[PDB]
């Protein structure tokens, strides 16, 4: 099964593990995981996180043929479980100094969900992309500006977290994957760049 390939100790997730647009697994609602985690579900989370680290490392991205990435959902690896990893980096300053925090968000989330959100909407000004999508998809992907999520980590400990800015956009994108929603489902059907008043455009 997919999961058996993925969790072999020597296996590194790369682009050949990523299923594509059209594969029915991207359109399912993923199955809740139960605690304590199997060995597999735990190893799967570490691999997914390892993949995002690799994709942001100039050397490993080049060794593995990996495109830069900040989130990955298990549906994208053909695994219908409610498991996402998020790794959102902070940026150096004009002087070249690393940030205090390497990441604004670094987490493997089991059973994540949006429990509440803002009336206000937000969109990345640059559109969104997807590891599974090999097309140029222009337009504003309309999301919530702010969300409160709950989720479990690999110990089964429950977290309640509020997010805004880019972290919020990233997490919504990944949660959508475990619900069978693709980014272009939240792009206006007639005008991709339609701005409804009040929309927070993130630069
Ligand atoms: O397909 C992806 C990667 C996507 C995540 C996103 C989260 C928000 C926008 C994209 C990504 N593309 C470029 N960087 O990250 N995640 O499911
Ligand atoms: Zn592989
Ligand atoms: Zn069930
Ligand atoms: Zn472990
Ligand atoms: Zn490594
Ligand atoms: Zn929502
Ligand atoms: Zn709502
Ligand atoms: Zn995606
Ligand atoms: Zn609750
Ligand atoms: Zn459409």
Swiss-Prot record:
GO terms for biological process: co-translational protein modification; translation. InterPro entries: Peptide_deformylase, Peptide_deformylase_sf. It is an enzyme of class 3 (hydrolase). The keyword Aminoacyl-tRNA synthetase does not apply. It comes from the Bacteria. Transmembrane segments: none annotated. The keyword Iron applies. It catalyses: N-terminal N-formyl-L-methionyl-[peptide] + H2O = N-terminal L-methionyl-[peptide] + formate. Binds 1 Fe(2+) ion. Fe cation binds at residues 130, 173, 177. Its EC number is 3.5.1.88. CDD domains: Pep_deformylase (cd00487). GO terms for molecular function: metal ion binding; peptide deformylase activity. The active site is at residue 174. Keywords: Hydrolase, Iron, Metal-binding, Protein biosynthesis. Removes the formyl group from the N-terminal Met of newly synthesized proteins. Requires at least a dipeptide for an efficient rate of reaction. N-terminal L-methionine is a prerequisite for activity but the enzyme has broad specificity at other positions. This is Peptide deformylase. The gene is def.
């Amino acid at each position: 099964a997919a999961i058996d390939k993925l969790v072999k100790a020597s296996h590194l997730i790369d682009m050949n593990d990523i299923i594509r647009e059209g594969n029915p697994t991207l359109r399912k609602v993923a199955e809740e995981v139960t605690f304590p985690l199997s060995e597999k579900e735990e190893i799967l989370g570490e691999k997914m996180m390892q993949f995002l680290k690799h994709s942001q490392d100039p050397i490993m991205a080049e060794k593995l043929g990996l495109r830069g990435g900040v989130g990955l959902a298990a549906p994208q690896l053909d695994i219908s479980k409610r498991i996402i990893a998020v790794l959102v980096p902070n940026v150096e300053d004009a002087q070249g100094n690393p940030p205090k925090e390497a990441y604004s968000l670094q987490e493997v989330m089991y059973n994540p969900k949006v429990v509440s959100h803002s009336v206000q909407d937000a969109a990345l000004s640059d559109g969104e992309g997807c590891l599974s999508v090999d097309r140029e998809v222009p337009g504003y992907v309309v999301r919530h500006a702010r969300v409160t999520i709950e989720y479990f980590d690999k110990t089964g400990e429950k977290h309640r977290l509020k997010l805004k800015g880019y972290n919020s956009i990233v997490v919504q994108h990944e949660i959508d994957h475990i619900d069978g929603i693709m980014f272009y489902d939240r792009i206006n059907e007639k005008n991709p760049f339609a701005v409804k008043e009040g929309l927070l455009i993130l630069e």
